[PDB]
Design a protein around this ligand. Structure first.
Ligand SMILES: Cc1cc2nc3c(=O)[nH]c(=O)nc-3n(C[C@H](O)[C@H](O)[C@H](O)COP(=O)(O)OP(=O)(O)OC[C@H]3O[C@@H](n4cnc5c(N)ncnc54)[C@H](O)[C@@H]3O)c2cc1C
Ligand SMILES: Cc1cc2nc3c(=O)[nH]c(=O)nc-3n(C[C@H](O)[C@H](O)[C@H](O)COP(=O)(O)OP(=O)(O)OC[C@H]3O[C@@H](n4cnc5c(N)ncnc54)[C@H](O)[C@@H]3O)c2cc1C
Ligand SMILES: C[C@H](O)CC(=O)CC(=O)CC(=O)c1ccccc1
Ligand SMILES: C[C@H](O)CC(=O)CC(=O)CC(=O)c1ccccc1
Lengths: 460, 461
């Protein structure tokens, strides 16, 4: 973390850079180098907080000339810990948070360091939105380059399915635009290929009009898991795109809507919404609320920006996390039993086994149209361990790996954005052989030296 | 609109400025010049979208040299239309949206063009917050320089009560820090004095840990309006600082939680929350919900970021607005009856007659401690007309003025941030004589040429 740098190279960076530099001896260094995954404790040589595209060009050129390992940081949410490095440089985009929204064009342009909640605030000023993840302080940058799904996805696709162009700084310091008609090969690869191809300084999206959404959340005893998960699996196979319904298996939070005698016990938390008219949504949600005996029901009509800010009401932010995730093409009764066995073993309050159903608009995009793999698998399961005390790391980590191995016969692929710091080896199976080959071709062209390799990495 | 500018002074500005200029010939000019009050239709000679403090210094100096009337824009929410001008320059801060948050120091440094939702997203990543307004796409900038109140205010004060310094670009193009120990005279004036003193490029705040919040919204028939409003006034007089409860008199929205038979009829929408433990919140909110017969009750436990994003679930963003507001020291039975008569006339589905109760932490700050007036008046009433069709402007504006004149014996002061385009003349009465005089002296010092006059303006003494 205290490497010898060239004075000419350094000075050239200083003259070109208009942002904020954070060095190891600076008072804000330990706080700045922390990322969401608290298990990742790494000490960069330098954190460069970029404030403009020309700043990113300067930081990229400086790292390449200096031989410093490049971490790129948008919102710092990497489950694999990719947005901080030991001994290298963090090209930190988090001050590049501006968004421009055209109401007449239903378009937004957002800088690559934006948090979802900033982007949603900006488009919802015009009752507009486009799909993104469900936790507002996630980074737009890493989430969109890996695909991006959330509440709007069954109706409007992945984030990348609404992306119309990007501005990107490539490894040789060039600034490029990529779109359907400009460097379309790079445009294909950034839609699902992660940070492998350059630093995205601006994303442009088409937007949709999204008015108030009927939302429900309720909790079922984990004793009713078999019927609840079977109701969910069966219902989602034929459900309108406008319905999204996700199951989180977890210890019940000590919330006042829930009876005190359920607090801290195994439950399924079901969250559902109707993307469409709220009277229709009231009718569609009432029809799924009795998958089991409902407890702690909350029903609300929410601005979409409030739906985005909702996940999840808790009194503590988990410090340490470990995830194991895959897709399923079908969720059999045997897999269902496996999930429920493993869920019964959760013994800490922040851990969830999540069961998502995508499909809808995500699955109608032809599989070769972007770099995002697995569009035809509707189910995602994520063993998301989360806890506080470092002495417990082995125990929580074992829980997630044990569940993943028990399910492994039922799982395929993986979402690159749910990969953990030990899953570098999963990249080829996540994309599959044809996509991975085509991604390697694009890599040979735009990042032939593999300068950007803190990501689910595609070697050229 | 196309004034002749000096070409050397323009190229110097352009070499110095890193942001975007939008001229009247540009495709995006008509959209960029629109502000939230769509009754305001003005045509700047230039919109300069600043990206940094040096951008702001370069735009200020260019305006001063060029003789251009200066509009400053944060999030564009000015009820008086101050963030756009005819024929001058808009120093548009909307791209300066960065927030740094220190969890260890519980401190946030936010740029002056941030929207509230961007700020609350950033602080809530650490479960932290500080008070601000209730609508996410409001600008931080104008709201804080006026004082700034919302759900966290009874517990934690105005936004300005949590402000610890600013970076500010003054009329002469200088960049200053104001705080308790540096230019403290300016620090006092900016905490409530609007944009009078310069362009704030960075605000620094102390933050508070705010976990999930029990929230309730319900609607009462206007037939029970006297009972509900009296219950509310009486309850708030002795209520814990942790309870906030606001009343919005409006047409009932066509939402599925309300019976079809109430839709489009005037009702009281009551919104309440407990800033504190949610089990205590559940107890406190159940105790106030039966002030009348509740309809369309929604109760939820929300992260504070979701409480901030909740107001208000509607299908349409209103285009045209007109507000008349003031404070009350007491809400008598006669004033209540007046509010109810005027609410019963509401025509638009977007209009509301708002009744807010501040007090708590806001009133505990000594009156002379900031430039924000009326801390000791706990009630605010806002007749907030909002609609779509420009041919209706005279009817909606007349409604808000009639209600204001009917209440005027009960009203004192005025929140600068709720003034409309026709209220330039309200500034002295809003601040009071002693505040207005002290502000005039600070004005004489920092903006003696009144370069910043598109605001609730304080001329220099
Ligand atoms: C609480 C939580 C909830 C989540 N929920 C969802 C969800 O609902 N849906 C979903 O799809 N995913 C979700 N995720 C996963 C998420 O998509 C990934 O964590 C994503 O990589 C986070 O992006 P980021 O910018 O915050 O992370 P970072 O750690 O900053 O970056 C992640 C990766 O992207 C690269 N990167 C970031 N910004 C850029 C850029 N502008 N240009 C180039 N490279 C970039 C980094 O180099 C790194 O490889 C969530 C994550 C968290 C922690
Ligand atoms: C829908 C809505 C909801 C509201 N809710 C609340 C509420 O809950 N609580 C509350 O207290 N107020 C609230 N307000 C009123 C709000 O505080 C004022 O409208 C405020 O002036 C808006 O600030 P802005 O930056 O968005 O507006 P702008 O129109 O951009 O600016 C308003 C004024 O401040 C100046 N200004 C803006 N940014 C700066 C800056 N960085 N430096 C110097 N001067 C600047 C402008 O020159 C102008 O005089 C709300 C307003 C709206 C439209
Ligand atoms: C925090 C966890 O590790 C990961 C997540 O939070 C992701 C997640 O919950 C899935 C998700 O995006 C989603 C997508 C559609 C509907 C509901 C939820
Ligand atoms: C939209 C209108 O023009 C103005 C508002 O909406 C402002 C407003 O409601 C006041 C406000 O900040 C508030 C403060 C505390 C509780 C509830 C509301």
């Amino acid at each position: 973390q205290f490497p010898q740098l060239d004075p000419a190279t350094l000075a050239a960076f200083s003259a070109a850079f208009r942002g904020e530099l954070i060095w190891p001896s600076d008072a804000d260094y330990d706080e700045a180098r922390r990322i969401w995954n608290g298990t990742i404790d790494r000490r960069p040589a330098l954190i460069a907080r970029c404030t403009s595209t020309p700043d990113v060009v300067a930081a990229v050129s400086f790292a390449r000339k200096s031989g410093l390992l490049v971490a790129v940081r948008g919102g710092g949410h990497s489950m694999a810990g990719h947005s901080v490095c030991d001994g290298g440089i963090v090209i930190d985009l988090s001050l590049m948070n501006s968004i421009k929204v055209s109401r007449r064009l239903r378009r937004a342009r957002a800088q690559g360091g934006c948090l979802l909640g900033a982007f949603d605030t900006a488009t919802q000023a015009h009752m507009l939105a486009t799909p993104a993840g469900v936790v507002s302080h996630t980074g737009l940058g890493g989430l969109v380059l890996g695909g991006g799904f959330g509440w709007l996805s069954r109706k409007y696709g992945l984030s990348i399915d609404n992306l119309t162009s990007v501005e990107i700084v490539t490894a040789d310091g060039g600034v490029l635009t990529a779109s359907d008609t400009e460097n379309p090969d790079l445009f294909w690869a950034v839609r699902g290929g992660g940070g492998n191809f350059g630093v995205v300084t601006a994303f442009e999206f088409d937007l949709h009009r999204v008015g108030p959404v009927r939302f429900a959340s309720t909790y079922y005893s984990l004793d009713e898991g078999p019927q609840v998960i079977r109701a969910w699996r069966d219902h989602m196979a034929t459900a309108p795109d406008e319905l999204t319904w996700a199951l989180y298996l977890r210890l019940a939070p000590p919330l006042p809507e829930l009876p005190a005698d359920m607090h801290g016990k195994p439950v399924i938390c079901a969250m559902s919404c109707w993307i469409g008219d709220p009277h229709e949504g009231e009718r569609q949600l009432e029809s799924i609320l009795h998958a089991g005996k409902p407890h702690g029901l909350t029903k609300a009509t929410l601005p979409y920006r409030a739906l985005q800010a909702y996940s999840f009401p808790g009194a503590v932010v988990p410090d340490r996390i470990y995830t194991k995730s895959g897709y399923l093409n079908e969720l059999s009764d045997e897999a269902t039993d496996t999930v429920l066995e493993h869920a019964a073993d959760i013994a800490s309050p922040f851990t969830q086994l999540e069961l998502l159903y995508l499909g809808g608009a995500v699955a109608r995009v032809p599989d070769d149209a972007t770099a995002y793999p697995n569009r035809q698998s509707p189910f995602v399961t994520n063993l998301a361990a989360a806890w506080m005390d470092p002495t417990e790391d082995a125990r929580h980590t074992a829980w997630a790996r044990e569940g993943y191995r028990a399910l492994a016969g039922h799982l395929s692929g993986g979402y690159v954005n749910f990969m953990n710091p030990g899953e570098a080896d999963r990249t080829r199976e996540a994309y599959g052989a044809a996509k991975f080959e085509r991604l390697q071709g694009v890599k040979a062209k735009y990042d032939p030296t593999n300068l950007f390799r803190l990501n689910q990495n595609i070697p050229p």
